Every structure is written in structure tokens, then in C-alpha cells.
Amino acid sequence: QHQALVDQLHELIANTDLNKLSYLNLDAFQKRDILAAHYIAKSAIRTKNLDQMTKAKQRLESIYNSISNPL
């Protein structure tokens, strides 16, 4: 479970690289949300905090889905 979650997080982090999301015209608040989630995700992974890893996974999944799809 731990490794599966780390892998999911790393995939989500890779898929939410701000440079690669330029074409989506994200608002500054969305960029900041992504930057914060990346910091939290990395920090949670490094410390093996499963609850915070779960939080960050749900957050990044939600963001990636919403920015990729109709308002």
C-alpha cells in the first residue's frame, strides 16, 4: 500500500508540473495550490506519513481532473 501510494503521488506530481500546464492558463491561486500540494506530497513521502500522503493524493487528483475538464 505504501509504495502504491508513493507511485500514485509521483505520477500526479509529474502530471502537474506548472511548466507543462502553461496551455491551461491557470490562475495564480491554482498555481499556488499546485505548488503547495507538491511540497506537502514530497514532505509526506519523505516522512512516510500515510495520512498526509493520502491527503496530497486526493488533492492532486482533484486538481488535475478539474483543470483538465469543463468548468
Q: How does DSSP assign 36-71, residue by residue?
A: HHHHHHHHHHHTT-HHHHHHHHHHHHHHHHHHHS--
Which residue, 15, 5, 21, is CA-closest to 58? 5
Coil, helix or strand for 30?
helix
CA-CA distance, 4 to 52, in Å (whole number)?
Answer: 15
C-beta separation of 56 from 30 below 8 A: no
Long-range contacts of 57-60 (CB under 8 A, 24+ apart): 57/5, 57/8, 57/9, 57/12, 60/9, 60/12, 60/13, 60/16, 60/34
Domains, the chain, ranges and CATH?
Answer: 1-71 (1.20.1270.10)
> 25 phi and psi, to 5 degrees?
55, 50
CB atoms within 10 A of CB 2: 10
C-beta separation of 10 from 57 below 8 A: no
Which residue, 23, 4, 7, 13, is CA-closest to 63? 13
- Resolution of the coordinates in A? 1.3
